[PDB]
């Protein structure tokens, strides 16, 4: 399984709130990057029901 | 900071009854966060794949607005 991605819009805006449980997997040092990874992970897990049974939607996660 | 939420706007490409292991989901997640977003606000277009099969399309949005950006999913098949 893999995620093929491209940045549609890239910025240098670092104004992102901190979070609880910043990810430490895949060599992440927690922090803001870990907050983003934990957010992506939750969204991917949520979408499993939609590839299993079809459908779309908008899913969110605190970052 | 200003951004407090990340959003995923998705649509199904193909039905796939399989499920990626935690190890795979973590690798997907870390790659995008570290090499795509790079700790900054932005928009990513993506496709979840199961081997060579294109399964799901997701537009990932990280912006100042905490509100649902809506719009359409975008992909990277």
């Amino acid at each position: 399984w893999s995620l093929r991605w491209r940045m549609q819009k890239s910025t240098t805006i670092a104004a992102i709130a901190g979070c609880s449980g910043a990810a430490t997997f895949g060599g992440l040092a927690g922090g803001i990057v870990g907050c983003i990874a934990a957010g992506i992970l939750a969204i991917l897990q949520g979408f499993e029901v939609n590839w299993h049974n079809g459908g779309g939607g908008d899913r969110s996660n605190p970052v | 900071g200003e951004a407090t939420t990340i959003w995923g706007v998705g649509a199904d490409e193909a039905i796939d009854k399989g499920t990626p292991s935690k190890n795979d989901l973590q690798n997907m997640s870390a790659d995008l966060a570290k090499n795509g977003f790079k700790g900054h606000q932005g928009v990513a277009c993506s496709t979840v794949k199961d081997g060579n099969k294109d399964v799901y399309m997701i537009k990932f949005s990280l912006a100042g607005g905490s509100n649902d950006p809506g719009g359409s999913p975008c992909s990277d098949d």
Side-chain angles (χ1 to χ4, degrees):
Chain A
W1 290 79
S2 66
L3 185 74
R4 191 178 147 94
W5 51 267
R6 65 195 164 74
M7 305 293 301
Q8 182 201 83
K9 182 183 187 215
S10 285
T11 87
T12 49
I13 300 166
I16 296 165
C19 71
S20 310
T24 66
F25 53 72
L28 268 26
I32 295 307
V33 173
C35 286
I36 295 164
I40 291 164
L41 174 77
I43 290 176
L44 292 171
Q45 291 174 322
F47 282 124
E48 292 176 359
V49 70
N50 302 108
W51 65 74
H52 289 161
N53 304 295
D58 297 9
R59 285 182 185 277
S60 80
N61 204 79
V63 79
Chain B
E2 74 170 352
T4 58
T5 321
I6 187 169
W7 282 96
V9 173
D12 187 45
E13 300 190 4
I15 294 284
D16 187 322
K17 300 286 180 186
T19 305
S21 63
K22 174 91 176 199
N23 283 349
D24 277 4
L25 284 169
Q26 290 177 166
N27 182 61
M28 287 170 55
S29 294
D31 183 44
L32 212 207
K34 184 172 25 52
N35 306 310
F37 288 96
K38 300 207 206 93
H40 310 122
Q41 290 186 6
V43 180
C45 292
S46 71
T47 303
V48 173
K49 298 177 73 190
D50 172 12
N52 295 111
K53 187 179 322 180
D54 287 307
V55 179
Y56 206 86
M57 60 172 77
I58 307 163
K59 174 178 69 175
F60 286 102
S61 185
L62 208 208
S66 67
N67 275 345
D68 184 355
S72 312
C74 55
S75 56
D76 192 23
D77 294 347

